[PDB]
Tab-separated table of C-alpha atoms in Angstrom:
chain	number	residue	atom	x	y	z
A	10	UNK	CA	10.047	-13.707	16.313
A	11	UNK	CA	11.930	-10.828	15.825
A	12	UNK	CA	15.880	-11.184	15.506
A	13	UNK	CA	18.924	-9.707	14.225
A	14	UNK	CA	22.097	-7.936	14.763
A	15	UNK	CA	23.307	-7.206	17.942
A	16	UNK	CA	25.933	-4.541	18.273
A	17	UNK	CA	26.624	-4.427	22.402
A	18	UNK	CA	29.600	-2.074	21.837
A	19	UNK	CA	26.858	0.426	20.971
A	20	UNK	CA	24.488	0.380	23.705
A	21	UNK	CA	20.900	1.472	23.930
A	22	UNK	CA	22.077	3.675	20.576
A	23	UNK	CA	22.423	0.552	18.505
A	24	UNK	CA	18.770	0.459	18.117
A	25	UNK	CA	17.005	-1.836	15.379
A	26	UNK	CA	13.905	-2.992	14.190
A	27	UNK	CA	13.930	-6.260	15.654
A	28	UNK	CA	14.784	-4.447	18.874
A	29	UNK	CA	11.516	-2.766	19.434
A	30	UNK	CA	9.082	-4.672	16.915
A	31	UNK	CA	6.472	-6.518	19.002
A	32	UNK	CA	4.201	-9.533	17.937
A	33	UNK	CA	0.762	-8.448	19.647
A	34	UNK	CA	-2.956	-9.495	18.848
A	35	UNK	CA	-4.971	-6.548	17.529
A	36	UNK	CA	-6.903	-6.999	20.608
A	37	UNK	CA	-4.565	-6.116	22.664
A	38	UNK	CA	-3.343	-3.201	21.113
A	39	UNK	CA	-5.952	-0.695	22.985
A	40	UNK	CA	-3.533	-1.308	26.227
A	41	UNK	CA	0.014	-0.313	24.631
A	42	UNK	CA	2.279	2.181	24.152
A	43	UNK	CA	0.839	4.204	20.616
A	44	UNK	CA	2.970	2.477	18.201
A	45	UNK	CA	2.607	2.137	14.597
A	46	UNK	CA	0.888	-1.560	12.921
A	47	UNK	CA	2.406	-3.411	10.584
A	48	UNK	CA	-0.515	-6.491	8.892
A	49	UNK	CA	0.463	-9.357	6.823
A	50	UNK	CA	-1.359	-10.220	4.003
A	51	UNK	CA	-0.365	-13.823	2.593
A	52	UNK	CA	-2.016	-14.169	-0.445
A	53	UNK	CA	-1.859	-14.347	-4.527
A	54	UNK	CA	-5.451	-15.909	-5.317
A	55	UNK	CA	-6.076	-12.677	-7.125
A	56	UNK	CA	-3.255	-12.829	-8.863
A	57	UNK	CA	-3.917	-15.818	-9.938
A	58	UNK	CA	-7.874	-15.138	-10.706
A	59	UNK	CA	-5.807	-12.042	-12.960
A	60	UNK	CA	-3.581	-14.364	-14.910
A	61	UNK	CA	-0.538	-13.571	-13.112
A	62	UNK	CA	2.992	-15.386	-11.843
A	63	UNK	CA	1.175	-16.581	-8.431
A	64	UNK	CA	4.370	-16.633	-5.395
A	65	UNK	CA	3.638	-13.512	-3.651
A	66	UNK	CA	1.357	-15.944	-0.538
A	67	UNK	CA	4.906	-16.156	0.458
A	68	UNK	CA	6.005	-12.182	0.633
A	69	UNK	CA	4.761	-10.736	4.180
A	70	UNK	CA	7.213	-12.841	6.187
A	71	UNK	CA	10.262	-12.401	3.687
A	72	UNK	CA	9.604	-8.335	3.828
A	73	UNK	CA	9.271	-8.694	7.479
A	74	UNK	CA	12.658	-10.410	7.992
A	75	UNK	CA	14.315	-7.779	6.114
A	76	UNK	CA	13.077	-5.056	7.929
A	77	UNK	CA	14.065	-6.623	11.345
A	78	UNK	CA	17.525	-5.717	10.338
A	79	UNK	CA	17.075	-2.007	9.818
A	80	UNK	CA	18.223	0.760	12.069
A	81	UNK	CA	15.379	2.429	14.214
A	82	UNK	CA	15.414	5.976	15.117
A	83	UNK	CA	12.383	6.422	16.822
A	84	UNK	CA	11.481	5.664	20.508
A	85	UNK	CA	7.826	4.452	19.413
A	86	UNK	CA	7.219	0.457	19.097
A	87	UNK	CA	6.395	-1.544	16.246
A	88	UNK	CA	3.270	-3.810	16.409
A	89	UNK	CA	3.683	-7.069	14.041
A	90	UNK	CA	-0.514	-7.700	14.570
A	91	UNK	CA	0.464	-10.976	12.492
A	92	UNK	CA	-0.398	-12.354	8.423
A	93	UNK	CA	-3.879	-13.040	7.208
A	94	UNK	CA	-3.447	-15.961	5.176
A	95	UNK	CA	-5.807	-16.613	2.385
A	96	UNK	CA	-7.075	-20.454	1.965
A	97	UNK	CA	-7.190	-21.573	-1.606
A	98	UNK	CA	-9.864	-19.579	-3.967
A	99	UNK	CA	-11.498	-17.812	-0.977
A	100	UNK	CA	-9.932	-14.894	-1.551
A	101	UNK	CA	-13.429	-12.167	-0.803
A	102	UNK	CA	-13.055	-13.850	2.537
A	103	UNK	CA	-9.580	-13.531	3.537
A	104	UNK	CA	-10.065	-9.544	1.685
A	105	UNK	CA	-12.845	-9.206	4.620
A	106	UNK	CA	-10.731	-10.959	7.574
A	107	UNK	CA	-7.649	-8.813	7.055
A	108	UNK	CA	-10.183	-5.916	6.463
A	109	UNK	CA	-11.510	-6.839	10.705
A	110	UNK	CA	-7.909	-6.301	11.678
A	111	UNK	CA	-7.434	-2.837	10.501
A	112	UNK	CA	-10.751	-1.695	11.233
A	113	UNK	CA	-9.763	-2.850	14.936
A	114	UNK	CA	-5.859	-1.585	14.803
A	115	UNK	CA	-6.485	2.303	13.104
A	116	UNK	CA	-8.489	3.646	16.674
A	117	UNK	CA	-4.682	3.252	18.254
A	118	UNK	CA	-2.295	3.140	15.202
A	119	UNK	CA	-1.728	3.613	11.542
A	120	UNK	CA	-0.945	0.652	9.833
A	121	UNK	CA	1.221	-0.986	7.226
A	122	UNK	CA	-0.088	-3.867	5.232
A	123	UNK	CA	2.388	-6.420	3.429
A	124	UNK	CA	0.971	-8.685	0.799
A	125	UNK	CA	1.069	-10.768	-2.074
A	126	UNK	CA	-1.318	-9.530	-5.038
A	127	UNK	CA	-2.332	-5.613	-4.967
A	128	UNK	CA	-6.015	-7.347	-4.181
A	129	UNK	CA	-4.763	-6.439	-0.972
A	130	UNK	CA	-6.192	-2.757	-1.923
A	131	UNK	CA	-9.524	-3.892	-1.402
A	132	UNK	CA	-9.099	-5.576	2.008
A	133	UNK	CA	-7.099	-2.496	3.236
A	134	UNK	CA	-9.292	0.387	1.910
A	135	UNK	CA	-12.345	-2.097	3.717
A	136	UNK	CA	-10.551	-1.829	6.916
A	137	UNK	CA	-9.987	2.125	6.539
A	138	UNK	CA	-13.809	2.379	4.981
A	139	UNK	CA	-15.223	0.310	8.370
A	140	UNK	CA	-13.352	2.305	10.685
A	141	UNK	CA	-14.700	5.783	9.518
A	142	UNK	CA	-18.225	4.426	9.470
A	143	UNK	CA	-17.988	2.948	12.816
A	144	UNK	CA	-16.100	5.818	14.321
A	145	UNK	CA	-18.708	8.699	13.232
A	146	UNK	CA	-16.339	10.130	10.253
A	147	UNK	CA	-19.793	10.014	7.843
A	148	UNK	CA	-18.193	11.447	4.204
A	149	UNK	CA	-14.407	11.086	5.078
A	150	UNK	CA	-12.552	12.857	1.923
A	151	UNK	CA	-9.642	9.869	1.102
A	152	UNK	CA	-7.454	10.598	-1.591
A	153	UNK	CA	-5.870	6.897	-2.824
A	154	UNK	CA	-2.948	7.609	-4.492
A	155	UNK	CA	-1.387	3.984	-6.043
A	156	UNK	CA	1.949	3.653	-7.734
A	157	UNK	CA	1.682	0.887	-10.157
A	158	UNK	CA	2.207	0.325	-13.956
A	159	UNK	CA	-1.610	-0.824	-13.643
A	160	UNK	CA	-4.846	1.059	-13.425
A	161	UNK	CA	-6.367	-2.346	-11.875
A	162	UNK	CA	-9.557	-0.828	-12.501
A	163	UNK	CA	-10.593	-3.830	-14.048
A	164	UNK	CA	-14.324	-4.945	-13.877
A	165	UNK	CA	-15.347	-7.418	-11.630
A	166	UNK	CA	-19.329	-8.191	-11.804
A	167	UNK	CA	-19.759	-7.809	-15.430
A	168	UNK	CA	-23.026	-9.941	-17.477
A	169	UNK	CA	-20.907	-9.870	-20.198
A	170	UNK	CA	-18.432	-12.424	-18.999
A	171	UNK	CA	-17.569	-14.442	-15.876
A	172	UNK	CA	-15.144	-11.985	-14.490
A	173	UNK	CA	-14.956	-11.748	-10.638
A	174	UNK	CA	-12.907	-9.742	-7.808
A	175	UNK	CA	-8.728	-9.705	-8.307
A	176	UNK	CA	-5.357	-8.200	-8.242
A	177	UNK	CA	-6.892	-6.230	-11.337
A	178	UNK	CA	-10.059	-4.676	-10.026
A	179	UNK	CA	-9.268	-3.599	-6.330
A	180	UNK	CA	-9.900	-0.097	-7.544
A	181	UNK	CA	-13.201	-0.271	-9.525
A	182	UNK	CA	-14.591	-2.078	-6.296
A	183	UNK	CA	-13.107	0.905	-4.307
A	184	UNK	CA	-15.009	3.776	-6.794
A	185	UNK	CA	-18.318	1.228	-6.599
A	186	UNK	CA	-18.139	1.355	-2.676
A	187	UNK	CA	-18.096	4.717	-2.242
A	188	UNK	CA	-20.363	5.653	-5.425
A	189	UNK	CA	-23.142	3.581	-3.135
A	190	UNK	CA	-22.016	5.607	0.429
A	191	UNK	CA	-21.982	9.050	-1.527
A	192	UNK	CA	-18.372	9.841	-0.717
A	193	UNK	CA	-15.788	10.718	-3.457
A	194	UNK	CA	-13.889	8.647	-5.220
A	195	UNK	CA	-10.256	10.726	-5.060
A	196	UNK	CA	-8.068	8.157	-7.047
A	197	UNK	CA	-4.301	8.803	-8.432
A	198	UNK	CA	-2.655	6.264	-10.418
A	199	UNK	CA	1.296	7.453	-10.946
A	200	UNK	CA	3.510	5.751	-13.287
A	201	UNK	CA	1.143	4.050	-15.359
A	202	UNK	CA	2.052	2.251	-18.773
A	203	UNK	CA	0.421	3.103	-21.872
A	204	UNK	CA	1.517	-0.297	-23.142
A	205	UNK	CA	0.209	-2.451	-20.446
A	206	UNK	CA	-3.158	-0.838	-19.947
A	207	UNK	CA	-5.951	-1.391	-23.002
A	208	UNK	CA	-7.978	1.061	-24.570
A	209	UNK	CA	-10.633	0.161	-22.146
A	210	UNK	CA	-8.787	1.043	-19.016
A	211	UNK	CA	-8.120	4.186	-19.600
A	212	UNK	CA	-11.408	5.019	-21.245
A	213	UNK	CA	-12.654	3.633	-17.412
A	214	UNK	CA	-10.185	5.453	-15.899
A	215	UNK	CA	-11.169	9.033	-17.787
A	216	UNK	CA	-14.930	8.222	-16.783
A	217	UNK	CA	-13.977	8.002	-13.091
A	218	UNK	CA	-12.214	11.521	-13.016
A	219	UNK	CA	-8.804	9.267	-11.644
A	220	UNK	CA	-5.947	11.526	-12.297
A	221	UNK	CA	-2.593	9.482	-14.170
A	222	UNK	CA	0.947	10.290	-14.906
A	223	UNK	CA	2.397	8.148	-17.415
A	224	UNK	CA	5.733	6.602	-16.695
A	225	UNK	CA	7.206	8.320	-19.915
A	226	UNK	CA	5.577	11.349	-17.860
A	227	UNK	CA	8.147	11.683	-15.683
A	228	UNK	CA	11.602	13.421	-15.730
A	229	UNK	CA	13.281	16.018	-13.862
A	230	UNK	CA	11.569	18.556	-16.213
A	231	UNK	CA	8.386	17.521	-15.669
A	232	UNK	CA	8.672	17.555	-11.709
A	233	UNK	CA	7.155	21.314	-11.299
A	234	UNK	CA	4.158	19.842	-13.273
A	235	UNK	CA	3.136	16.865	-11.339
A	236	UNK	CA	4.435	17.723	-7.647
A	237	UNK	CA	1.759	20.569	-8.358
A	238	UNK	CA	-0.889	17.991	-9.258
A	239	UNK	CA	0.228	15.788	-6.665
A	240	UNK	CA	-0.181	18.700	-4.571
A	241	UNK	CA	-3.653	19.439	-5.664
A	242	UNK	CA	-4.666	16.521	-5.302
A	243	UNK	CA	-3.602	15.894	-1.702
A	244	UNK	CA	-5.057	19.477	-0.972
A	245	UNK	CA	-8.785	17.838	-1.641
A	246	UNK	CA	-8.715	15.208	0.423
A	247	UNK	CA	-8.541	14.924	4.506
A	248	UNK	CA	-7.100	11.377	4.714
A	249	UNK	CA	-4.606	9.764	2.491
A	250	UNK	CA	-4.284	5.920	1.471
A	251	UNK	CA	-0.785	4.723	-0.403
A	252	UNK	CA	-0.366	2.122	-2.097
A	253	UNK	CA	2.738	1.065	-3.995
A	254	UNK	CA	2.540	-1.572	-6.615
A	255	UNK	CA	6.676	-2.897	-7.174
A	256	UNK	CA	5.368	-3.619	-10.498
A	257	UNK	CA	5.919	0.358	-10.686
A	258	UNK	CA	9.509	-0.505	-10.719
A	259	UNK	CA	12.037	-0.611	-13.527
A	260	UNK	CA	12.607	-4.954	-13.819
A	261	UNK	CA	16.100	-4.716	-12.775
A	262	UNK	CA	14.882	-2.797	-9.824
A	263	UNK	CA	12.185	-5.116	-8.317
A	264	UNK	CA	12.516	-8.413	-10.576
A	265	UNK	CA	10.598	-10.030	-7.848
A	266	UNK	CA	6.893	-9.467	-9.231
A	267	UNK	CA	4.160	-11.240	-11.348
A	268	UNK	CA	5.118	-8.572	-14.083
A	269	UNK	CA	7.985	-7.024	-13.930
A	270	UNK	CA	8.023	-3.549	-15.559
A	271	UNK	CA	9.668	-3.680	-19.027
A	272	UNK	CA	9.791	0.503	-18.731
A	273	UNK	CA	9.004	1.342	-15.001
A	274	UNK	CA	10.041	4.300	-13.350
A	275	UNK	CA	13.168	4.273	-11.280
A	276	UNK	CA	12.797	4.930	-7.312
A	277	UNK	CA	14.862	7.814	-7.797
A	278	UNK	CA	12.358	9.599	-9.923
A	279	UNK	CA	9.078	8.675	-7.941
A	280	UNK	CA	11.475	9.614	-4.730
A	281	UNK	CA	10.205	13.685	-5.041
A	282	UNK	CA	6.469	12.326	-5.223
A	283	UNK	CA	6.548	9.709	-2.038
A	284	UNK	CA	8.751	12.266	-0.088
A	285	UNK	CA	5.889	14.736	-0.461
A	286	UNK	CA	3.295	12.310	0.086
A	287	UNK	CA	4.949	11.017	3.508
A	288	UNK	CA	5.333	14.550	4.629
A	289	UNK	CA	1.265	14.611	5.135
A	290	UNK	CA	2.125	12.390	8.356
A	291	UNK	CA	-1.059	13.703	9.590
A	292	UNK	CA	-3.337	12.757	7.157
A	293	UNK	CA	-1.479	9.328	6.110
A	294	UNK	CA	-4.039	6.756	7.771
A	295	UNK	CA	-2.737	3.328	5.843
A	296	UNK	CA	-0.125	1.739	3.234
A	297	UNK	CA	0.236	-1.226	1.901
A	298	UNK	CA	2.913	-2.186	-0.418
A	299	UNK	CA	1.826	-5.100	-2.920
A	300	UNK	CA	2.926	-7.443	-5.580
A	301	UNK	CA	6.443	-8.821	-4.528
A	302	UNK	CA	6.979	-12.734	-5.446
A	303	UNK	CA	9.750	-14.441	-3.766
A	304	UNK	CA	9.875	-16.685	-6.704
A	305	UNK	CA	11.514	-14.480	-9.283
A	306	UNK	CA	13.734	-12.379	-6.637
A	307	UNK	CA	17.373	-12.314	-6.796
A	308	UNK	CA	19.062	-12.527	-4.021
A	309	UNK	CA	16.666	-11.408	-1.993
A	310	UNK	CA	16.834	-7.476	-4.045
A	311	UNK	CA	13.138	-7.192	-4.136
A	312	UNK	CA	12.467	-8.312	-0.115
A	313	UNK	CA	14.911	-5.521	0.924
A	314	UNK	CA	13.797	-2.802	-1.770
A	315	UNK	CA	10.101	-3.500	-0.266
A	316	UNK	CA	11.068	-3.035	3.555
A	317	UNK	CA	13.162	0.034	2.725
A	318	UNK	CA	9.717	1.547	1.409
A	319	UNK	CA	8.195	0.287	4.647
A	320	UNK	CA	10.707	1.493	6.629
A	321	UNK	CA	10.249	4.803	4.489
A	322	UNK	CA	6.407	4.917	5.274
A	323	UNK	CA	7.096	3.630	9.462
A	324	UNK	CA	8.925	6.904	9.759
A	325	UNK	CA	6.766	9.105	8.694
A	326	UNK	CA	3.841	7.140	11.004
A	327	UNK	CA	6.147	7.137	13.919
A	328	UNK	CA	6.867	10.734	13.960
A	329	UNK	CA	3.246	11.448	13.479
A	330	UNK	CA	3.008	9.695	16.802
A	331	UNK	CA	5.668	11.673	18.792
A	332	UNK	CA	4.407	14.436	17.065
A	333	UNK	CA	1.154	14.650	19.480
């Protein structure tokens, strides 16, 4: 249920969230008013499978509070299609389930998924991947732009060790999907750290043509040189997919994560770069925001930081909708 404040002194005006969000099954989302979809993703397996601080199973629901309190401006409904829960180890499967629901909800609405571990980039780009295929777009042009400290292009089928699928290698299994579909694999990775990624990563990362900006990169100088970059980069693409790691974040920012960043870059500096990206309404077909762990928040600082940046992305979806 969605719940909150109630201002009566301010009439129909004293619109919120929790006013207009609407708990709906996929399914039934073909006969309703063109909203925007928000999908829970309750799980941490791969963060666990990564050797990271598991907690973030319990995320979707704590983001989702938080952002029933927020004002609304839009006259376009909210559609809470519900949390995929993943069941002990089986995370592939639950990557696959939550994958069905946005293949299902992106014919009528662009969609917001919540998780735990950023393996919720592989169930998400699945969904968007399943509904081009089955909806006749045959070499869609997706640019995947990621904000994370990470490259989490880690391998996952390797023969020379028992590595497997996780909050690590959502991106490698993005490039090897579409290497095998012959589309392009357009992958940005902003604000990564030089200290947290190995030799190896960013060797792998070179190799795959994935365009980086350090988080020492950035600084008001620096902003003519990557917006243009950024802006490059969106120019090649026809559908966008963002995807915001809070382990981006400075620690005293987002402290609720398996990691938090010992460096980071502050919201206000990566501010310029999501502004731009949200202005591509038209081409902005998903987000998900991933990694926040209930179990090293502080009073509740990382819950509300992550639905401000949904709230953030739900505007820009919503006017898209009014927009045609």
């Amino acid at each position: 249920t969605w719940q909150g404040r109630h201002d009566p002194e301010d009439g129909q005006a004293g619109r919120r969230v929790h006013h207009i969000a609407c708990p709906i099954q996929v399914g039934e989302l073909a006969n309703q008013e063109p909203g925007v979809a928000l999908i829970g993703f309750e799980c941490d397996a791969g963060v666990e499978r990564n050797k990271g601080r598991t907690g973030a199973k319990h995320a979707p629901s704590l983001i989702k509070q938080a952002l029933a309190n927020l004002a609304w401006h839009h006259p376009i409904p909210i559609y809470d299609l519900g949390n995929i829960r993943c069941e002990g180890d089986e995370l592939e499967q639950a990557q696959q389930e939550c994958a069905q629901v946005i293949q299902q909800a992106l014919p009528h609405a662009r969609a917001i998924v919540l998780g735990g571990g950023h393996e919720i980039a592989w169930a998400t780009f699945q969904g968007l991947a399943q509904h081009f295929l089955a909806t006749g777009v045959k070499q869609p042009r997706i640019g995947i732009i990621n904000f994370d400290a990470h490259f989490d292009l880690r391998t996952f089928e390797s023969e020379l060790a028992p590595v497997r699928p996780s909050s690590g290698t959502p991106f490698n299994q993005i490039h090897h999907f579409c290497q095998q579909q012959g589309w392009d694999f357009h992958y940005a990775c902003l604000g990564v750290s030089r200290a947290s990624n190995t030799p190896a990563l960013f060797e792998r990362a070179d190799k795959l043509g994935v365009w980086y900006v350090e988080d020492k990169a950035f600084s008001p100088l620096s902003l003519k040189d990557h917006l243009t970059q950024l802006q490059h980069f969106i120019d090649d693409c026809d559908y966008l997919y963002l995807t915001i790691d809070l382990d981006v974040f400075p620690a005293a920012s987002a402290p609720g994560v398996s990691a938090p960043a010992a460096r980071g870059v502050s919201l206000e500096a990566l501010a310029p770069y999501f502004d731009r990206i949200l202005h591509y309404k038209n081409k902005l077909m998903i987000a998900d925001i991933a990694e926040y762990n209930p179990s090293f928040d502080i009073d509740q600082h990382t819950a509300r930081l992550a639905a401000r940046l949904c709230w953030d992305i739900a505007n820009a979806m919503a006017e898209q909708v009014q927009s045609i």
